[PDB]
Structure 1
Amino acid sequence: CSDNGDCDQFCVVCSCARGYTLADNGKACIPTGPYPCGKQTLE
């Protein structure tokens, strides 16, 4: 795999952590809720 095989998260075949889905590009990760794992929170 690794420029991380262009993946936003896991790995050319990408995958994401629970609470995200792999985008149409197949390289990006999209949150499924307002508080996905590993993202700092904003008001």
Structure 2
Amino acid sequence: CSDNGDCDQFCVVCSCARGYTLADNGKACIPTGPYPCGKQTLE
């Protein structure tokens, strides 16, 4: 895990925080709702 395993969040096996699912690629993280944790909010 030492480019972070190419993972968008947690780390080879990537994973994501609550309110996200790992994308098909298995590296990116996709928010399930409009206000996922840890994202600045957009108007």
TM-score (normalised: structure 2): 0.96
Identity of aligned residues (%): 100
Moved beyond 6 Å, runs of 4+: none
Task: Measure the CA separation in 1 of the matches of 2:13 and 2:20.
Answer: 16
RMSD over equivalenced CA pairs, Å: 0.5
Aligned length: 43
Where does structure 1 lack aligned partners over 5 or more consecutive residues? none
Where does structure 2 lack aligned partners over 5 or more consecutive residues? none
